Amino acid sequence: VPEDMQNEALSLLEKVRESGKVKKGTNETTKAVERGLAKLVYIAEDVDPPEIVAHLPLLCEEKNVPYIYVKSKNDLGRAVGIEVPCASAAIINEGELRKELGSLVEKIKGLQK
RNA sequence: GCUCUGACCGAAAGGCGUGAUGAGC
């Protein structure tokens, strides 16, 4: 995954919360995809463990939900407007960014073809 | 120990989304 396309996602995410709705933390993120409410899922690459966020990759591709990998969990942290680093996040409501997001959805899907 | 909740607990230092708090089992 790109670092250029990565800064984009974080941007969307940080604003997405201003209008739409976002879920922060592996626990809520997982339960989000399991309930088909995961528009997009963010995953940090710098996790401790691994065994703590490893299940997500699979669950998304099988739930037909897009997942994006990000460099630092701290970045995913300040994006979510949280104080503690976040290891994973899932946006459940695109909000007033929907369209602006749908484009990002394809850029990732067009990264695995 | 787990389930649900999901942002606070603390005088402070600090400790929490790798899960504060509060239900339950």
Side-chain angles (χ1 to χ4, degrees), chain A residues 16 39 43 70 84:
Chain A
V16 159
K39 302 316 185 69
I43 309 171
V70 175
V84 172

Side-chain angles (χ1 to χ4, degrees), chain A residues 1-60:
Chain A
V1 55
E3 285 83 358
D4 57 309
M5 191 180 276
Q6 164 179 168
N7 317 311
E8 180 181 297
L10 296 172
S11 307
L12 181 59
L13 180 50
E14 178 173 347
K15 172 178 294 178
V16 159
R17 61 197 218 63
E18 307 311 312
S19 57
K21 189 171 182 175
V22 188
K23 290 298 186 187
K24 22 163 198 53
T26 297
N27 280 70
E28 307 194 69
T29 287
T30 302
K31 303 170 78 168
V33 310
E34 309 180 316
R35 283 176 262 184
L37 302 179
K39 302 316 185 69
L40 172 58
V41 170
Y42 293 63
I43 309 171
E45 303 180 305
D46 63 314
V47 200
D48 93 271
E51 46 92 51
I52 192 63
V53 78
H55 69 299
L56 287 188
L58 207 178
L59 225 188
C60 287

Side-chain angles (χ1 to χ4, degrees), chain A residues 12 16 20-23 29 32-33 35-42 60 63-68 89-95 98 101-102 104-105 108-109:
Chain A
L12 181 59
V16 159
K21 189 171 182 175
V22 188
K23 290 298 186 187
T29 287
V33 310
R35 283 176 262 184
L37 302 179
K39 302 316 185 69
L40 172 58
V41 170
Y42 293 63
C60 287
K63 276 292 182 177
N64 301 174
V65 48
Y67 62 113
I68 186 64
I91 153 183
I92 58 179
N93 177 285
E94 356 74 3
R98 41 116 60 277
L101 162 158
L104 177 52
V105 186
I108 305 179
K109 296 196 65 178

